[PDB]
Symmetry: D2
Subunit: 411 residues, 4 copies
């Protein structure tokens, strides 16, 4: 029924963002929850402020890399559960980057770098806080502190792409005074996108614009009750098991799974964040760079559909995971489980005719071609039953796109 | 029945090797079979010799990286199907590195680098050759050329760890004169390990030491007919779908699958080779470096068992993929499918007691501990039925080893 | 909360037989045939003229239920087609008293159940294709539905329960459940009320669940009435008889589903569709006999066994049931034991572990043959490991059950 | 090489019934009971005294085979236990003439087969637990085995075939197959010789395969004799009757296995184990009735259909069979079609594709109900795509078959 507000339409066009976890935890490289889960002495853990130099943090390099990977926004942790702030809190707290050797407002560097690359800057903010005794001792006063921290971000950095709130789930029963928090954001940042990790329950507040979901969600996501405000959706993937850097977490997902995940998000009508954890001093680690390079080659190829493509009621035949995305000028077949083509005696698996069918395309087609190399595909249609069948040829030897995309040109 | 001859015994102790594909094909970055598969004009393809500078080939860097990853040998392509030689063929052919701008014997650099790191140098040699017309026109004379090219390798580089022969499968019916070829190797290099891609029912020549197998072979490999020479086994994994570099092959396996495959080779009684394809100019590509760093962290942890551990008739309980490796002083439980441990309300999957059982351990045990952190495991035994059950605790937050290894200390 | 007595008794029933029989049975193309095959209503309703019930024997049905180890039977008293298998005493002419059968089949059924010590349950469809009231005057339909249930509550003596199906057809409507269930409580205070569709009315006693539900079912909010649960399985794809539906489940899957219901804390109904004239088909008998062999073996745990917070090791589907005197290990994926050269899969030691048993054990034995199992315990971590020996050649129970005797 | 006439005839049989019946049947714990349960030989062999065959009716068995669509029957004439179901004419006292039955059961069987136009096949175990010759004087055992086969070749008229099982017990021994098979060829030149486990002797006509074999079977080296193939399925885990083996396969799996045999170019035997006294058990009758409905529907292709190099699209298990007049699409994983708001899974258009059909098609229709299917072709790439409509409510064939009529 209702259609997205302009700022939410713009959000859905972003498609892909980079999530960045960086805090004091990064110096230990054993996960962002280390303070709580490893039962550390608070006083000793908080001494990490003294070695927070940010000596290798280069916001320009990060924004350039985000642009190259095809991301259109970046979510940076401005304050995680540990409660340390990566920006100048202007007197709210001494546990911030201005009281660290770094002495730079990192958020200011980040916002300027994003603007130069035409990326939207988003601010992650943890609402469950392990630093301030207010959280357990005086929750109402905690709410004021949380709100003021958000307000500083709202008033000192120019227009903000969005806020990414995490952690109300810690006290599911409490009154978090969302009307006041969100209202303040609307007042200073009317165009900001408000994302919530615990947006659902029916949404947790009318001002929420986006709700997060499990990456494995099978079907098109929920957009709100009819006649209510349309709410977008977003999924997240981290490269291993942890969000902050974790040196001895070897359990990385394949680049292939990462590409399939990104494609999948688009298929169910969501944005996707791909997460990297910076080193203690703020560098992109070499492993993350590898994943970004590979994803970048895919998103460059997929550019005609990744941003504007939307789910459409077109299904694939029995036993395939193929799907279709719609833009106003074209449909795109996203085709999975292809193999590489050999020659003569050398059989790699992609060589035979490979009919892939779809149900729901009722218009006559002029031409279909692979985005990666412009090869024209042969096809048949039954317009009455709305059946399309293409011969989905395998990859040219030497290449393998994991999710291959064919563009349909209508008559 | 028979046991390995000493060179073979030493070979099985190597455990892990690095496979390196580098040739003229590397300059195109569309796979090592590009000349045949892409139906290239030979003269045009072979012009790549003129730009083969090897400007970024540093054998010391490669040997260092192999050492860091825990490899004990390196197999370098000395001549692939394209038929170009990476060494000085001393007049046998003009299609060699001495006729390229590089003007350096790359095999000589490689052998010196290996020796300084205590790695065995192995020479891959393609027996199916696309360059010399002898191959199709005058097979007997081809055999002489092949043999002479191996003789140069046998006589000019000091003691060689081994030869890795690939391509007799191209003419399954021909007489390859293996006794003469292998006999010549035994003359000059008595201690060299001879590996064959299609060396297997019956082995293709008595002089073969190692035969290759698919990585997914489920059970302990075949060692030869009972009264006959024991032959070792080896599996291979490439990181994507290609052996030479392939810039638009995004279909990389996960680091986790790589670790599981290394453990699996050891479990079935084989060595494992992890393949990297160099850039046109001979650099290790950034993606391969990422995989090497991850594997290196695992093999450093697994060092007590990776080299000397051998299969043993001890099975795991129903529904697990766990297995056991034996050394003279210890058994090691290799345990898969573990999760990370959270704390209190924060549940990551690994926190409950996790009984993993094995059948075939008959001796009383004194202590069991994880290699990664020395945590002591609780266990129970039934000595009559030869049952061991351990509580396989999950990973400490911030880490995940994919295959976790517990050392058993017997009473 | 603790379940009301009648609900405790319900959970002890364990297994029931579901019986689908109506005019649809004469065509043997599924119970929804009238709607799904778009039949002419007038022509379909003529099936009343050939409804003889010539082979319906309520005593044979009760016998079959007893033999299979069922403790109750749910009979379709009126399905969506809207034909009543009992005397509606003037409410409708579309009932068995206007059919050639001329027998109140519900009265036969109730008597047959009581003689075998089974509880009789009445299925009633609330979505009705026969009366124009359903679409054209919903409030008056509610009165008709309620009256049809009132007859069942007032003409047969004490009744085991009612099984309501079809409120799902109008999810938004006011079904006036307080009045319907209030009337039931008035005449039948002890009847179990089951509903196919937070619970929809305080008077509901049991709620249905999909047979594949993975985890222990929901019993109500704390401080509220405890509600039981039930799953259902039909042998092929249809509930009424369907002659050319060859897609029968394996007997093994049937046994696994019965065990699974107990594991999640639910009863289970196994459905049979009678022939046009009311006979149990031969195919259904075969399933019953196989099931009967299993439930006879499982008798010490099938009725009183309850879920307990004891899990099985990684990679097994084994589970535990608790009675007040014993725990029982329900062990899946066993193979048959050969001899020497003949290896059938079950011969090696087969350690199966469980977490959550904290008491020292004296003895463990298979229910099927009394073989004593070896085991080890770690009482601190609450680990039990048994060597689950494979089946004796010539037998295979699908779900094998070991009884634990505590010290 | 083209197959020999008798082998061509064999491949046209398609489906046979396998029947296990011996002394073991009286104990109902599997046909290997004597060896696997380590029984006292003397005590086990006393079962001859209660072998009455009181319920064996060869005419009923032949009728049931005909009804299920089988074209031949393989009967165990002597299993490992070594008891003979026929008159061995002095070769052994451990035969049916020395049992209360006092009837040549093989003679009854052959006559019953002939009246129903079925080929009679004789299973003979070559691994024998009765005669001490087997372990103590193997060469003399071969003479005894050969003589026992000679009786079957000389006293019963033309024999459809022999089904030899058990050379696998001594893989290395010289079984003197030239002499055994040569003797069969002399007396029964037209008999099919089947061997259960390069072929072991030129005279073998059929070789057995695992039922799960994925690809078209091996027919012999080129320039050599063509050898046919056969797979077998038993209903539970045992071949002889086993009362407490509840681990039955689904009827659906049975149908899929029959279709599968044809797909790989093999015949299929479906096994039943008789009761001690020679009756078909009720459970087996249920499976036979279900299979019979499928084979009656599949009759146009079940006998003459042959594999052909036409493959199905990615992600389906569909396949094609060729006769000289038609191709047939065998389509799996279909669902039932509901109506309007009632969704059963089969209602959307369901494009199923095949590669390898190069000729223009006039019409395609389902064998079960004659519904005409819509389709498209790309003749250059040899692609056919059909809309494989789901089952009419009330039916489910498991493997549905569409006949192609070419222009
Ligand atoms: C993007 C992710 O967002 C939250 O994820 C959570 C937060 C809370 C719970 N929780 O309370 O279970 C689980 C995941 C963070 O806690 C996490 O570190 C990461 O930043
Ligand atoms: C390690 C690998 O070894 C061989 O792999 C082959 C060779 C032949 C076939 N073949 O004939 O199918 C397949 C893979 C090489 O061809 C390949 O380039 C690589 O070096
Ligand atoms: C036991 C069964 O009870 C209902 O089954 C249903 C009812 C509703 C749904 N539903 O709403 O999804 C599914 C199955 C009936 O529709 C069916 O005919 C049979 O009697
Ligand atoms: C038809 C069947 O024939 C054999 O089945 C076998 C025999 C040998 C093997 N084998 O050696 O693997 C497998 C099944 C018999 O063992 C069985 O009793 C039955 O009669």
């Amino acid at each position: 029924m209702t259609e997205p507000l302009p700022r939410i339409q713009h959000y859905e066009d972003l498609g892909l963002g980079l999530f960045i976890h960086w805090g004091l935890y990064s110096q230990m490289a054993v996960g962002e929850w280390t303070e709580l889960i490893h039962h550390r002495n608070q006083h000793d853990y908080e001494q990490l402020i003294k070695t927070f130099t940010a000596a290798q943090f280069d916001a320009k390099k990060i924004a350039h890399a985000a642009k190259a990977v095809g991301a259109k926004y970046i979510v940076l942790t401005t304050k995680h559960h540990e409660g340390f702030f990566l920006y100048d809190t202007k007197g709210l707290s001494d546990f911030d980057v201005m009281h660290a050797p770094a002495r730079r407002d990192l958020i200011a560097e980040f916002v300027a770098a994003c603007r130069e690359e035409d990326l939207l800057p988003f601010f992650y903010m943890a609402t469950y806080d392990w630093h301030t005794p207010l959280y357990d001792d005086d929750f109402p006063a905690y709410l004021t502190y949380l709100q003021k921290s958000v307000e500083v971000l709202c008033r000192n950095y120019g227009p903000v792409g969005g806020f990414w709130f995490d952690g109300n789930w810690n006290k599911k029963d409490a009154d978090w005074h969302l009307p006041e928090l969100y209202g303040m954001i609307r007042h200073y940042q009317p165009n900001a996108i408000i994302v919530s990790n615990t947006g659902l329950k029916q949404v947790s507040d009318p001002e929420i614009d986006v709700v997060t979901y499990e990456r494995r969600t099978p079907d098109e996501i929920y957009h709100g009750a009819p006649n209510e405000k349309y709410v977008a959706g977003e999924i997240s993937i981290t490269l291993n098991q942890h969000w902050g850097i974790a040196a001895n977490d070897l359990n990385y997902k394949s680049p292939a799974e990462m590409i399939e995940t990104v494609a999948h998000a688009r298929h169910i009508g969501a944005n996707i964040l791909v997460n990297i954890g910076l080193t203690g001093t703020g560098a992109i680690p070499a492993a993350a760079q590898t994943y970004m390079h590979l994803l970048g080659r895919w998103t460059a190829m997929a550019a005609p559909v990744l941003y504007k493509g939307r789910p459409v009621p077109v299904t694939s035949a029995h036993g395939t995971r193929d799907f279709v995305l719609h833009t106003s000028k074209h449909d795109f077949l996203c085709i999975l489980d292809l193999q590489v083509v050999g020659k003569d005696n050398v059989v790699l698996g992609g060589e035979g005719v490979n009919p892939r069918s779809f149900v729901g395309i009722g218009q006559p087609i002029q031409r279909i071609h692979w985005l990666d190399n412009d090869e024209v595909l042969s096809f048949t249609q039954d317009l009455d039953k709305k059946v399309l069948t293409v011969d989905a040829t395998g990859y040219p030897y030497g290449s393998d796109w994991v999710v291959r995309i064919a563009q349909i040109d209508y008559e």
